[PDB]
Design an enzyme around this catalytic site. Structure first.
Site, PDB file in Angstrom:
ATOM      1  N   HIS A   1       0.913  -1.081   0.041  1.00 21.85           N
ATOM      2  CA  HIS A   1       0.077  -0.044  -0.003  1.00 21.85           C
ATOM      3  C   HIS A   1       0.966   1.383  -0.072  1.00 21.85           C
ATOM      4  O   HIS A   1       2.037   1.225   0.114  1.00 21.85           O
ATOM      5  CB  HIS A   1      -0.849   0.201   1.328  1.00 21.85           C
ATOM      6  CG  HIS A   1      -0.332  -0.072   2.437  1.00 21.85           C
ATOM      7  ND1 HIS A   1      -0.045  -1.505   3.291  1.00 21.85           N
ATOM      8  CD2 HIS A   1       0.354   0.814   3.411  1.00 21.85           C
ATOM      9  CE1 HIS A   1       0.544  -1.150   4.286  1.00 21.85           C
ATOM     10  NE2 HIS A   1       0.788   0.097   4.519  1.00 21.85           N
TER      11      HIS A   1
ATOM     12  N   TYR B   1      -3.399   3.537   2.086  1.00 15.07           N
ATOM     13  CA  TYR B   1      -4.532   3.512   0.956  1.00 15.07           C
ATOM     14  C   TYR B   1      -4.177   2.336   0.173  1.00 15.07           C
ATOM     15  O   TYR B   1      -2.727   2.356  -0.163  1.00 15.07           O
ATOM     16  CB  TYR B   1      -4.921   4.713   0.262  1.00 15.07           C
ATOM     17  CG  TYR B   1      -5.444   5.622   1.382  1.00 15.07           C
ATOM     18  CD1 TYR B   1      -6.934   5.545   1.669  1.00 15.07           C
ATOM     19  CD2 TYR B   1      -4.831   6.732   2.127  1.00 15.07           C
ATOM     20  CE1 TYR B   1      -7.447   6.375   2.772  1.00 15.07           C
ATOM     21  CE2 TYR B   1      -5.372   7.524   3.026  1.00 15.07           C
ATOM     22  CZ  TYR B   1      -6.632   7.243   3.504  1.00 15.07           C
ATOM     23  OH  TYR B   1      -7.193   7.941   4.286  1.00 15.07           O
ATOM     24  N   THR B   2      -4.828   1.619  -0.472  1.00 15.21           N
ATOM     25  CA  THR B   2      -4.354   0.619  -1.623  1.00 15.21           C
ATOM     26  C   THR B   2      -5.321   1.176  -2.827  1.00 15.21           C
ATOM     27  O   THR B   2      -6.399   1.231  -2.840  1.00 15.21           O
ATOM     28  CB  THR B   2      -4.552  -0.828  -1.121  1.00 15.21           C
ATOM     29  OG1 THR B   2      -4.105  -1.113   0.050  1.00 15.21           O
ATOM     30  CG2 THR B   2      -4.389  -1.582  -2.448  1.00 15.21           C
TER      31      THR B   2
ATOM     32  N   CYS C   1      -8.425  -7.598   6.810  1.00 12.68           N
ATOM     33  CA  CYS C   1      -8.258  -6.056   6.695  1.00 12.68           C
ATOM     34  C   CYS C   1      -9.761  -5.476   7.429  1.00 12.68           C
ATOM     35  O   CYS C   1     -10.599  -5.482   6.530  1.00 12.68           O
ATOM     36  CB  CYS C   1      -7.822  -5.269   5.667  1.00 12.68           C
ATOM     37  SG  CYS C   1      -7.277  -3.732   5.803  1.00 12.68           S
TER      38      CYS C   1
HETATM   39  C1  LIG Z   1      -3.839  -1.380   3.849  1.00  9.02           C
HETATM   40  C2  LIG Z   1      -4.973  -0.375   4.191  1.00  9.02           C
HETATM   41  C3  LIG Z   1      -5.741   0.197   3.063  1.00  9.02           C
HETATM   42  C4  LIG Z   1      -6.689   1.020   2.965  1.00  9.02           C
HETATM   43  N1  LIG Z   1      -7.049   1.368   1.871  1.00  9.02           N
HETATM   44  C5  LIG Z   1      -8.345   2.329   2.065  1.00  9.02           C
HETATM   45  C6  LIG Z   1      -8.745   2.681   0.595  1.00  9.02           C
HETATM   46  O1  LIG Z   1      -8.393   2.343  -0.495  1.00  9.02           O
HETATM   47  N2  LIG Z   1      -9.987   3.547   0.888  1.00  9.02           N
HETATM   48  C7  LIG Z   1     -10.382   4.110   2.334  1.00  9.02           C
HETATM   49  O2  LIG Z   1     -11.373   4.897   2.223  1.00  9.02           O
HETATM   50  N3  LIG Z   1      -9.659   3.557   3.281  1.00  9.02           N
HETATM   51  C8  LIG Z   1      -8.590   2.875   3.148  1.00  9.02           C
HETATM   52  N4  LIG Z   1      -8.189   2.343   4.274  1.00  9.02           N
HETATM   53  C9  LIG Z   1      -8.501   2.939   5.500  1.00  9.02           C
HETATM   54  C10 LIG Z   1      -7.776   4.324   5.781  1.00  9.02           C
HETATM   55  O3  LIG Z   1      -6.452   3.936   6.230  1.00  9.02           O
HETATM   56  C11 LIG Z   1      -8.454   5.149   7.045  1.00  9.02           C
HETATM   57  O4  LIG Z   1      -8.491   4.366   8.096  1.00  9.02           O
HETATM   58  C12 LIG Z   1      -9.581   5.843   6.413  1.00  9.02           C
HETATM   59  O5  LIG Z   1      -9.449   6.723   5.401  1.00  9.02           O
HETATM   60  C13 LIG Z   1     -10.271   6.701   7.482  1.00  9.02           C
HETATM   61  O6  LIG Z   1      -9.298   7.426   8.216  1.00  9.02           O
HETATM   62  P1  LIG Z   1      -9.746   9.019   8.561  1.00  9.02           P
HETATM   63  O7  LIG Z   1      -8.419   9.724   8.664  1.00  9.02           O
HETATM   64  O8  LIG Z   1     -10.511   9.692   7.713  1.00  9.02           O
HETATM   65  O9  LIG Z   1     -10.452   8.816   9.966  1.00  9.02           O
HETATM   66  P2  LIG Z   1     -10.078   8.859  11.427  1.00  9.02           P
HETATM   67  O10 LIG Z   1      -9.772  10.265  11.916  1.00  9.02           O
HETATM   68  O11 LIG Z   1      -8.570   8.051  11.391  1.00  9.02           O
HETATM   69  O12 LIG Z   1     -10.947   8.006  12.276  1.00  9.02           O
HETATM   70  C14 LIG Z   1     -11.106   6.811  12.840  1.00  9.02           C
HETATM   71  C15 LIG Z   1     -12.132   5.864  12.687  1.00  9.02           C
HETATM   72  O13 LIG Z   1     -13.387   6.677  12.932  1.00  9.02           O
HETATM   73  C16 LIG Z   1     -14.350   5.520  12.105  1.00  9.02           C
HETATM   74  N5  LIG Z   1     -15.419   6.554  11.841  1.00  9.02           N
HETATM   75  C17 LIG Z   1     -15.166   8.141  11.787  1.00  9.02           C
HETATM   76  N6  LIG Z   1     -16.157   8.688  11.232  1.00  9.02           N
HETATM   77  C18 LIG Z   1     -17.252   7.714  11.074  1.00  9.02           C
HETATM   78  C19 LIG Z   1     -18.191   7.678  10.581  1.00  9.02           C
HETATM   79  N7  LIG Z   1     -19.378   8.593   9.967  1.00  9.02           N
HETATM   80  N8  LIG Z   1     -18.925   6.572  10.415  1.00  9.02           N
HETATM   81  C20 LIG Z   1     -18.521   5.409  10.584  1.00  9.02           C
HETATM   82  N9  LIG Z   1     -17.364   5.406  10.941  1.00  9.02           N
HETATM   83  C21 LIG Z   1     -16.631   6.512  11.285  1.00  9.02           C
HETATM   84  C22 LIG Z   1     -13.741   5.140  11.166  1.00  9.02           C
HETATM   85  O14 LIG Z   1     -13.749   3.440  11.363  1.00  9.02           O
HETATM   86  C23 LIG Z   1     -12.251   5.692  11.252  1.00  9.02           C
HETATM   87  O15 LIG Z   1     -11.482   4.718  10.585  1.00  9.02           O
HETATM   88  C24 LIG Z   1      -7.132   1.352   4.271  1.00  9.02           C
HETATM   89  C25 LIG Z   1      -6.403   0.888   5.379  1.00  9.02           C
HETATM   90  C26 LIG Z   1      -5.435   0.014   5.286  1.00  9.02           C
HETATM   91  C27 LIG Z   1      -4.658  -0.643   6.551  1.00  9.02           C
END
Ligand SMILES: Cc1cc2nc3c(=O)[nH]c(=O)nc-3n(C[C@H](O)[C@H](O)[C@H](O)COP(=O)(O)OP(=O)(O)OC[C@H]3O[C@@H](n4cnc5c(N)ncnc54)[C@H](O)[C@@H]3O)c2cc1C
Length: 272
Positions: free
Chosen positions: A49, A65-66, A245
């Site tokens: 990723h 992200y992937t 994942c």
């Molecule tokens: C290997 C890998 C690949 C990934 N690929 C992708 C990808 O291609 N596309 C993608 O979108 N993400 C992907 N993710 C997830 C990504 O890394 C983030 O976790 C995601 O984008 C959310 O991050 P954030 O900073 O917006 O949320 P953060 O600020 O980190 O929030 C923490 C968590 O709160 C939860 N959350 C917050 N608000 C809400 C809400 N309204 N409803 C439900 N849950 C909520 C979510 O579960 C979120 O992850 C991947 C993760 C991994 C490990």
């Protein structure tokens, strides 16, 4: 010859320019970023990723992200993103940091990419190379089938591997995906997964579960459990590789205990 790669060094950050943003549905986006030239490729091995990094409301935020693109795509990288808006989920009132920042970007803005990263690389024809850590070297595990458990955003690491397998007609690896989501509406990449099932049903098995189901629902309801793993992943007798994942309560409570109950070796179950 081979195309120039973008990700030359994993400790360099590459600011890539946003060139297109698709509104897939109310809270799903596809973002396309230009690579350094139209002839470049990203340079992301299957299994790995990238990270995005930015200063968001004054603080550093880094997330993995992937892409939904591959090294077959010249000139661009595509990310499919679930936007977590504030004031939508009662347990997460602030929403998500990086996903809302992405949603705020204007065409022409840049964001830093880095990679490739990850302890697993798919080497083709059933062969996986899996490091126990970033300085240790990898275990060249070879399997006939792969069980995949994704929750929510965790689909894209699975999709990348599924597509790499399916596009090699001489790769006989069978992938079994169990994909969990909050609701039917919240499922990412459903058309794409169902196209793969349509074209490759012998090598690609697809099942969904949702925490709460719609009135008309053909699949499972509830969190991943023992029965779903028995019914929708290869049996442990066949020594599949198990990839996961999803949100860390999903892995801890729903996946690992139930993989063990079925008899898969817990410590072999790989989390992206
Ligand atoms: C290997 C890998 C690949 C990934 N690929 C992708 C990808 O291609 N596309 C993608 O979108 N993400 C992907 N993710 C997830 C990504 O890394 C983030 O976790 C995601 O984008 C959310 O991050 P954030 O900073 O917006 O949320 P953060 O600020 O980190 O929030 C923490 C968590 O709160 C939860 N959350 C917050 N608000 C809400 C809400 N309204 N409803 C439900 N849950 C909520 C979510 O579960 C979120 O992850 C991947 C993760 C991994 C490990």
């Amino acid at each position: 010859s081979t195309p120039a790669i973008t990700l030359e060094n994993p400790d360099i950050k590459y600011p890539l320019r946003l060139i297109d943003k698709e509104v897939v549905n109310h809270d799903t986006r596809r973002f396309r970023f230009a690579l350094p030239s139209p002839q470049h490729i990203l340079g992301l091995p299957v299994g790995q990723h990238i990270y995005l990094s930015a200063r968001i409301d004054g603080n550093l935020v880094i997330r993995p992200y992937t892409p939904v693109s591959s090294d077959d795509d010249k000139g661009f990288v595509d990310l499919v993103i679930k936007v977590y808006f504030k004031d939508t989920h009662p347990k997460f009132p602030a929403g998500g940091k990086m996903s809302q920042y992405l949603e705020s970007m204007k065409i022409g803005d840049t964001i830093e990419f880095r990679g490739p990263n990850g302890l697993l690389v798919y080497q083709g024809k059933g062969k996986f190379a899996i490091r126990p850590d970033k300085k240790s070297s990898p275990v060249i595990k070879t399997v006939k089938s792969v069980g995949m458990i994704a929750g929510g955003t965790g689909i894209t690491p699975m999709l990348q591997v599924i597509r790499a397998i399916m596009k090699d007609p001489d790769d006989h690896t069978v992938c079994h995906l169990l994909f969990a989501n909050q609701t039917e509406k919240d499922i990412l990449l459903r058309p794409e997964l169902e196209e793969l099932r349509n074209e490759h049903s012998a090598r690609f098995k697809l099942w969904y579960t949702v925490d709460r189901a719609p009135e008309a629902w053909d699949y499972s309801q509830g969190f991943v459990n023992e029965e779903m793993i028995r019914d929708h992943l290869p049996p442990p007798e066949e020594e599949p590789l198990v990839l996961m994942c999803g949100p860390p309560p999903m892995i801890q409570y729903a996946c690992l205990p139930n993989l063990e109950r079925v008899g898969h070796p817990k410590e072999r179950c790989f989390a992206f």
